[PDB]
Each structure stands twice: as structure tokens, then as C-alpha cells.
Amino acid sequence: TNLVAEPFAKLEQDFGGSIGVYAMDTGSGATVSYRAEERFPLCGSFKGFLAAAVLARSQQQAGLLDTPIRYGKNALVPWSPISEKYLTTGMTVAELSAAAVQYSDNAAANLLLKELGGPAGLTAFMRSIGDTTFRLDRWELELNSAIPGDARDTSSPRAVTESLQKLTLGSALAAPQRQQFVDWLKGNPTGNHRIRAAVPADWAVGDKTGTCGVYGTANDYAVVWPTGRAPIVLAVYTRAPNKDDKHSEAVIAAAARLALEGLG
């Protein structure tokens, strides 16, 4: 593990913070781990799991995805580029889910959380798939505070990867819901400088990013489909000690590359 870990330790020292990584080869079972059981703030990365929770609920409530959500101005919070434009008409549950995943739309995220029973409702969904580490405690935007020591609104790289594998490749979602989730992740355009930058262009990637805006705290998780080979699932999370420390997309891409090259 010393030869596995040392390049990650070098990377986080030059970054000036902490990096957590977990990667799983779903064919062979091989893994790469660094700080994989430590907690890191989720920031907007929870929005991918939120869409999965909505899709899972649609397996018990036919027509949930078509349900219209007609909201007022008070539902709008900062960084709501899609939901801001449909204030005059409303949006359906599926349209809000797409916006939360692919634009990180905050109002859409809060509206979907409300449908699920709040942050506690998303945490309960994660428990239902066997994830005991994930916890969402607050709403947008308070969940982005990323204060050192605080376990609220955190998970671990290993738990993120394990849950992502269950939802995108395992049995948690039925085939139509599973392909919708995978398509939302694959079409996400916000992570071109993160895990995607470490992956050969020929290989499809689906990802969800998060960027708290403070404490150098940012992240990305992804499924990678190498051609003609079993997919890889991985998660890369960062944080830093000072409130004004800057996050780095380059550090996330570099850590992703170190993990992908070390699988085997």
C-alpha cells in the first residue's frame, strides 16, 4: 500500500489539502484506495443520488416521474438556471431530476428533496441500498458549508463508489430507470476537467460533480466504460483547511488518473 499511496500523498501536499479516492474494477474486483473511509462534504454530488432516489420511488409509484410540480418564486435559490425559467409554467419530477443532475440546479434539488420528505428522506433511501455512511442533514444552500470537523452532509469515497455501482450497474434500479440514470450521468457537461479529463476519449463516462465554494472542497464520482471490458466505478473528493483555500479541478483529474492506472 506504500507504493499505491505515495503519489496520492504527494498530490495532496502540493494541493495543500486532503484527497480521498476509491476505485473499483467491477469485473475483477480489484480496487485502489486512499483515505477511502474518511468523510468528505458531498456538496452538489448528492444530486446524482437524489435523482436515483426519485427513479427508485417511481418503481413503487407509477407515474411519479410525470407528476407536475408548480412552484412559486420562494422555491428559487441561488444557482437555479433551469428552474428559474419555468417559474411561469412548472416542471415535472423527471424534468427537475434532469436539471439537478446535469445543471446542478439548486431549486430543483430542494423541490425533489421536499417530495422525498426532506434531507432525511434521501438519507433513508441511501440506507435502503445498504449505504450506512452517507448522510444528508441540510438543504441547499446550507449543506455546502463544508466546515472542518463537521460530519453533516458528508460521505466517504468508498461508500460513494459502492452506492454508485449498485445504482448504475447492480439491481437497485429496474432497466428503464437504470438507463435513464446512466444517460443523465453520461450527458452531464459540468465535469469535463475532472474525472473525464483522465479517461481516453474513446471510453464513455458518466459523472456528477460537486463544488462547495469554500475550504477547497470539491469532488467528482463516475462510471467509466472501457471498450469491451468491465466498467470501472470511482470517486474523488477533496477538502482543505482554510476557508479561502481554492479547489482544483486539475488535482481531481490527476488523482483520478492515478487511481485508474493502478487498477490492473
Ligand X SMILES: C[C@@H](O)[C@@H](C(=O)O)[C@H]1CC(SCCNC=N)=C(C(=O)O)N1
- Of the pair 44, 262, the CB lying nearest ligand X is at 44
- Of the pair 83, 209, the CB lying nearest ligand X is at 209
- Tell me which residues in 221-260 interact with ligand X (CB under 6 A): none
Q: For residues 251 and 188, give the distance between their C-alpha atoms in angstroms, rounded to a whole number.
A: 20
If binding is defined by CB under 6 A, does position 110 make contact with ligand X?
Answer: no
- Of the pair 83, 104, the CB lying nearest ligand X is at 104
Which of 18, 31, 102, 104 is close enough to bind ligand X by CB under 6 A? 104
If binding is defined by CB under 6 A, does position 154 make contact with ligand X?
Answer: no
Taking CB under 6 A as the binding criterion, the range among 88-96, 210-218, 222-230, 233-241 that sits at the site for ligand X is 210-218
- Of the pair 123, 144, the CB lying nearest ligand X is at 144
Is residue 264 within 8 Å of 28, Cβ to Cβ? yes
| 184 to 203: interface string for ligand X, x by CB under 6 A | ------x--x----------
C-alpha cell at 68: 407536475
| 6 to 35: interface string for ligand X, x by CB under 6 A | ------------------------------
| CB-based contacts of 82, cutoff 8 Å, min separation 6 | 91, 99, 103, 105, 108
- The residue at minimum Cβ distance from ligand X is 44
If binding is defined by CB under 6 A, does position 41 make contact with ligand X?
Answer: no
If binding is defined by CB under 6 A, does position 156 make contact with ligand X?
Answer: no
Q: What b/e string do you get for 100-138 counting C-beta neighbours within 10 Å, with b at 16 or more?
A: bbbbbbbbbbbbbbebbebbebbbebbeebebebbbbee
**Residue 105: enclosing H or E segment and its boundaries?**
none
By three-state DSSP, how is residue 48 classified? Answer: helix
Q: Report in angstroms how near the CB of residue 171 gets to ligand X at its nearest.
A: 28
Judged by CB under 6 A, the number of residues near ligand X is 13
- Tell me which residues in 78-97 interact with ligand X (CB under 6 A): 79
- Nearest Cα to Cα of residue 211 among 189, 190, 230: 190
Q: For residues 202 and 220, give the distance between their C-alpha atoms in angstroms, rounded to a whole number.
A: 20
Strand ranges (DSSP E) for 9-149? 18-25, 31-34, 40-41, 68-69, 91-92
If binding is defined by CB under 6 A, does position 209 make contact with ligand X?
Answer: yes
Which of 20, 210, 216, 231 is close enough to bind ligand X by CB under 6 A? 210
Contacts of the segment 26-29: beta carbons below 8 A, 24+ positions apart: 26/165, 26/169, 26/230, 26/231, 26/232, 26/233, 27/229, 27/230, 27/231, 28/230, 28/264
Which of 31, 80, 110, 144 is close enough to bind ligand X by CB under 6 A? 144
Given the rule CB under 6 A, which residues bind ligand X? 43-44, 79, 104, 106, 144, 190, 193, 209-213
